[PDB]
Write a protein that binds this ligand. Structure first.
Ligand SMILES: O=C(O)C(=O)CC(=O)c1c(Cl)cccc1Cl
Ligand SMILES: [Mg+2]
Ligand SMILES: [Mg+2]
Ligand SMILES: [Mg+2]
Length: 716
């Protein structure tokens, strides 16, 4: 019909044309050979892909039955452990080893700093994310609640000097704490100059140098009256901008205009849980943005050039202006009708993403005609985050998929590197083996704690009612999971070789709380962690200036801080855990978050949205937070905590409020009062009522079906 025949495959024409006219030119890959390879790789690897998914279902069925045949309230951990080993869930731990991944860029092997994740289908957001390698600290402090909006310090239509002076003082303390002077405080500086290759800071009664002059990295403008001074601390750059005639500079004792922080060191361009892509048209929209980013010519606003500096001694150098880009492919579960076979069966989407995003990534290995030939990877790697894997065999399948794609693309073996999400229970408890199976490709491990919480609930669905969603974040199993991840990475030699990463801060407006609390992640040895915005990347960067992550990792070496038993502690709620009002709060909490996210997913194809929780906190929602919410309500329904009328009432209670939050979005179609005429409302209900029967609690089967249903109704 609208499809192209290649071997056993029938490729949607819009995808075929995109690859041929846009992605292949410039790669020197013969098109006929590429498409033949697509057919061959799909033909060869689809059977094992399916067997792996069938094995998940078989393991879950056995675990479900294990719980159903037992009465004893305290789970006998010795028996449970023996059972998981019996059925092949818990595998033997391999001998100690060190990863051998080579050809990785310094932003990954060495630098500790924030990692930003952004939906690749939004070109404006993706551009801003790539440019977020540098960000204004003054803008992040002035614009967020990190500076409280106390009396006199509020934001207004125009600049509030009381507030600005607080921003200035906050940043002076940061400089004092990060790049200390030999004597005195940056707060009292009157000027900066460069003399004999040394930074000299003028104070009211004297001048001083840096306590550690090696932290002076360079400057711009004349040495005797610079326009900026560049410092480095824990491998991250700080730039003091000097302009006494600027709007902020005129108020500053040294004429300082701003403090620029190296912020988003790396960025993950997401094809997975933060985007809605259910057919070839949606996939091409995302592939084309990924292509623009790797060619440097994406424009919505354009991509930044590298930054030019004068060295202390007076030579010239440059620093990268863009964040180093990963791409998050989808995982092993879903198919997509962008390609179907001769039976009409859809092709696995993860296989397609490896082929198409790897092809497109070749452009990021060569000079771009649109900015000073910036190469995403100078060392020659393609960085793919692979989510939602369950255990070492699934990691091995990813490595073999990448190997076969490298052959189709004519790339050297192991060009395609893997950032492993540790976000499913069966990977958590076999993590050493998972790393070993990717020992020559792995570039990070990351605790995707929200997916991991959803898997936790689904895996033990039959055991009993789980604690409330907010309680999960502090349960024994998750704290052990976080420490176990760091322990495994460090023991595999990640320090100096690969990132050890932690999860996303989702409260996009609570930046004071983020700055107060997220420091725990670098303090735990994580060399990176996820932020939702360029502004949050700049603010999270502060933590890497306060915490010497490299020293932390060095002091953690050899420690074994989590046992298998701690990892397997199921978050079952205690008897009589909740009052009636607390149960209704949690139902309303989850139903509002589900509805607010799903309505924009199904009706507008938006895969990540800010949705208020029960306490009015704006939360960046994506599929993982939806997985938790729907699995938790499904678990409470499964065990008699709530009735199906409680669920219906809550969904109908919260639905008009969600309509109110989205009012007038032109393309907004209200759910109330005719709930069962709304495909989005029905999707939300189905996610809860079918949640116990979704494989590992994944939300994509229902979301994809319902989004496609919406698109089909709109077309007629
Ligand atoms: O926790 C894991 O499972 C993740 O993988 C996290 C994730 O996607 C995400 C993103 Cl990028 C933005 C907003 C909210 C979340 Cl939850
Ligand atoms: Mg069953
Ligand atoms: Mg995840
Ligand atoms: Mg230090």
């Amino acid at each position: 019909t609208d499809r192209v025949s290649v071997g056993n495959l029938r490729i949607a024409r819009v995808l075929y044309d995109f690859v041929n006219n846009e992605a292949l030119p410039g790669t020197d890959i013969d098109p006929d050979s590429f498409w033949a390879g697509v057919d061959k790789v799909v033909a060869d690897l689809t059977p094992q892909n399916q067997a792996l998914l069938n094995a998940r279902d078989e393991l879950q069925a056995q675990i479900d039955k294990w719980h159903r045949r037992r009465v004893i309230e305290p789970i006998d951990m010795d028996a449970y452990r023996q059972f998981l080993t019996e059925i092949g869930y818990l595998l033997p731990e391999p001998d100690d080893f060190t990863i051998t991944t080579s050809g990785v860029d310094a932003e990954i092997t060495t630098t500790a700093g924030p990692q930003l994740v952004v939906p690749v289908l939004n070109a404006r957001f993706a551009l801003n994310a790539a440019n977020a390698r540098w960000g204004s600290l003054y803008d992040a402090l002035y614009g967020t609640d990190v500076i409280p909006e106390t009396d006199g310090a509020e934001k207004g239509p125009t600049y509030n000097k009381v507030r600005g002076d607080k921003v200035i003082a906050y940043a002076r303390k940061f400089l004092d704490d990060s790049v200390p002077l030999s004597s005195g405080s940056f707060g009292d500086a009157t000027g900066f100059t460069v003399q004999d290759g040394q930074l000299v800071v003028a104070l009211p009664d004297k001048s001083t140098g840096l306590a550690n002059p090696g932290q002076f990295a360079g400057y711009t403008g004349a040495a005797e009256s610079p326009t900026s001074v560049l410092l480095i601390n824990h491998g991250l750059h700080i730039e003091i901008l000097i302009d006494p005639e600027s709007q902020v500079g005129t108020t500053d004792r040294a004429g300082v205009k701003d403090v620029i922080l190296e912020s988003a060191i790396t960025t993950i361009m997401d094809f997975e849980d933060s985007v809605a892509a259910v057919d070839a048209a949606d996939k091409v929209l995302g592939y084309r943005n990924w292509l623009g980013l790797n060619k440097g010519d994406l424009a919505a606003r354009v991509l930044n050039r590298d930054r030019n500096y004068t060295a202390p001694g007076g030579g010239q150098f440059t620093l990268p202006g863009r964040s180093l880009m990963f791409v998050r492919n989808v995982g092993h579960l879903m198919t997509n009708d962008a390609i179907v076979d001769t039976d009409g069966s859809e092709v696995f989407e993860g296989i397609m993403d490896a082929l198409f995003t790897g092809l497109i990534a070749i452009h990021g290995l060569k000079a771009s005609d649109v900015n000073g030939p910036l190469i995403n990877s100078r060392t020659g790697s393609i960085y793919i985050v692979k989510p939602k894997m369950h255990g070492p065999a699934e990691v091995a399948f990813t490595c073999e998929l990448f190997s076969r794609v490298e052959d189709v693309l004519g790339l050297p073996q192991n060009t395609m590197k893997i950032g492993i999400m540790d976000e499913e229970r069966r990977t958590t408890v076999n993590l050493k083996a998972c790393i070993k199976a990717a020992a020559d490709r792995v570039v990070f491990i990351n605790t995707g704690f929200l997916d991991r919480t959803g898997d936790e609930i689904h895996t033990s669905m039959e055991a009993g009612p789980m604690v409330r969603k907010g309680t999960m974040k502090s349960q024994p199993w998750i704290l052990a999971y976080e420490d176990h991840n760091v322990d495994a990475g460090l023991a595999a030699g990640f320090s100096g070789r690969a990132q050890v990463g932690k999860g996303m801060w989702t409260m996009t407006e609570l930046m004071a709380d983020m700055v107060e609390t997220k420091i725990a992640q670098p303090r735990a040895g994580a060399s990176t962690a996820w932020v939702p915005s360029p502004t949050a990347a700049t603010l999270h960067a502060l933590h890497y200036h306060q915490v010497d992550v490299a020293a932390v990792q060095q002091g953690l070496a050899g420690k074994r801080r989590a046992t298998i038993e701690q990892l397997l502690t199921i978050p079952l709620a205690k008897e009589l855990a909740w009052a009636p009002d607390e149960i209704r709060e949690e139902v309303d909490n989850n139903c509002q978050s589900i509805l607010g996210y799903v309505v924009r997913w199904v009706d507008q194809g938006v895969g990540a949205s800010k949705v208020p929780d029960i306490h009015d906190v704006a939360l960046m929602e994506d599929r993982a937070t939806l997985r938790i919410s729907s699995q938790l309500l499904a678990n409470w329904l499964r065990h008699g905590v709530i009735t199906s009328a409680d669920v219906r009432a809550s969904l109908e209670r919260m639905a008009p409020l969600v309509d109110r939050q989205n009012a007038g979005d032109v393309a907004y179609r209200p759910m109330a009062p005719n709930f069962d005429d709304s495909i989005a409302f029905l999707a939300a209900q189905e996610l809860i009522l079918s949640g116990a029967q979704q494989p590992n609690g994944y939300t994509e089967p229902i979301l994809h079906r319902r989004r496609r249903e919406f698109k089909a109704r709109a077309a007629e």
